[PDB]
């Protein structure tokens, strides 16, 4: 997951997530949390969705 800083075109990264990112959102009055949907494309038989709520402060999984 890449946060592009548009002022300077920089970017912050959160790598090695559990699956490919289908959806991203900034969820809060002050952007406290990031809500992500992960896919886990390894399993071709089924689509394995996972909802991940990350704390924007330290990018730790607040709720998986």
């Amino acid at each position: 997951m890449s946060l592009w800083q548009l002022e300077t075109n920089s970017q912050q990264f959160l790598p090695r997530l559990n699956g490919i990112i289908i959806d991203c959102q900034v969820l809060g009055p002050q952007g406290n949390y990031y809500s992500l949907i992960l896919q886990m494309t390894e399993n071709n038989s089924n689509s394995d969705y996972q909802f991940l709520l990350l704390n924007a402060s330290d990018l730790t999984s607040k709720l998986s």
Binding site: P15, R16, N18, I20, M40, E42, N43
Partner: protein, 128 residues
């Protein structure tokens, strides 16, 4: 309840209806990097059979490693057997033994049966 996901095992507690763990049980490009483009054609090791002894303290896992395409050794699958053990208090299985190409080379382990409690106090298994 143990689900053999591809190259990983999902431990899921159906009483609470919550996942309790997700563990990688094989080598390979599993979370080292995100595969993109032709890297996405690679197949990680597949956990085919996963079984517990009657005592429940040992876990036997059978894996198939697929070679990359476009090589001379692109057709010689590698069959692996692994014996994992874990104390009840902790949640992470620790690998104790690893057997590469059991039964010979390129011969699958089609069946696995943990032994009954009578023989070796459930610390044996059969592979066929």
């Amino acid at each position: 309840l143990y689900f053999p996901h591809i190259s990983a095992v999902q431990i899921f507690d159906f009483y609470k209806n919550e996942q309790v763990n997700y563990q990688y049980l094989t080598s390979g490009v599993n979370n080292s990097m995100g595969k993109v483009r032709f890297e996405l054609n690679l197949q990680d090791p597949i956990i085919t059979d996963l079984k517990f002894t009657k005592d429940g303290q040992w876990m036997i896992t059978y894996e198939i490693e697929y070679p990359p395409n476009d090589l001379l050794s692109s057709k010689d699958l590698t069959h692996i057997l692994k014996f994992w053990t874990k104390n009840d208090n902790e949640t992470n299985w620790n690998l104790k033994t690893k057997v590469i190409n059991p039964h010979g080379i390129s011969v699958p382990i089609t069946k696995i049966l943990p032994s009954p409690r009578s023989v070796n106090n459930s610390q044996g298994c059969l592979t066929a």
